[PDB]
Amino acid sequence: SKISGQNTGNYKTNIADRIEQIFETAPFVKIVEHHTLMTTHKMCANWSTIPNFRFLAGTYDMFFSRIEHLYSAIRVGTVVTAYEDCSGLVSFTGFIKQINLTAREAILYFFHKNFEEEIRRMFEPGQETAVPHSYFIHFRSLGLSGKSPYSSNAVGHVFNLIHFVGCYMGQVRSLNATVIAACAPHEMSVLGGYLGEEFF
RNA sequence: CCCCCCCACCCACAAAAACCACAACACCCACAAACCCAAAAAACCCCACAACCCCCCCACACCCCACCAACCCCACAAACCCCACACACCCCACAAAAC
């Protein structure tokens, strides 16, 4: 339900086939034969919006991440729930690791007034951004949430800068990420150009 | 058109690796005599009856020119963006998102 968009048909079928083969082979047994999953998805495309359905998926993913299980393969549906709507924060942490910076040092390179609000927004204390298996990883899926201050839009300038540097270094993930048009992409690209020059 | 965890060469038993090896061998050489897919002789332009030798010609003629009026595959007028009701005007937008 989440993976809806332009030109994603062959790809939805491929993930669905991977899903079906997982659940048709041991420790799971084939109960729906083939192509049933795609057809139910056609009628169940907006099931992601349903709050209880999202809540349960997140709960399942939290349980399977901490405890290893025979049916741990169920996580393949619920993996999307982890770090949901926190792409900004996820992009930042990868950027720190790919660039080989201490995160603090990385923020020093953000030479613009606009980054200030975003830096405060994503680094607010008291949220378990520092705990390995906390409710935070599934916070959006679970009830304890609001619009995420960690989403690529909430931290639009930082997100743009990160992937613009990623594009300069040829990171495919950044090449295919969708740019936040509101948050001054042109200025972000210029700064990203210099930073990538330094890091490539 | 990112992700199940662990993981992460479409790496892996042993013994081993020239898609080497019986021996005899090793021109996908060879029967000899011979070794031009030469030769009877006479011949030797796929020359020649002769007249002839433009696939030239009746004459008048000789633009596959011509009735004249003519002669843009111009034209009624009004016209003349294959322009317009307003409202408008990203083939943008629920939210959440957004490898």
TrEMBL record:
Subcellular location per the Swiss-Prot or TrEMBL entry: Host cytoplasm; Virion
Similarity comment text for this entry: Belongs to the lyssavirus nucleocapsid protein family.
GO CC terms in record: helical viral capsid; host cell cytoplasm; ribonucleoprotein complex; viral nucleocapsid
Protein name per the record: Nucleoprotein
Domain of life: Viruses
Species per Swiss-Prot/TrEMBL record: Rabies virus
Residues of the full protein shown: 151 to 350 of 450
GO function terms (MF aspect): RNA binding
Primary location: host cell
Keywords: Capsid protein, Helical capsid protein, Host cytoplasm, Phosphoprotein, Ribonucleoprotein, RNA-binding, Viral nucleoprotein, Virion
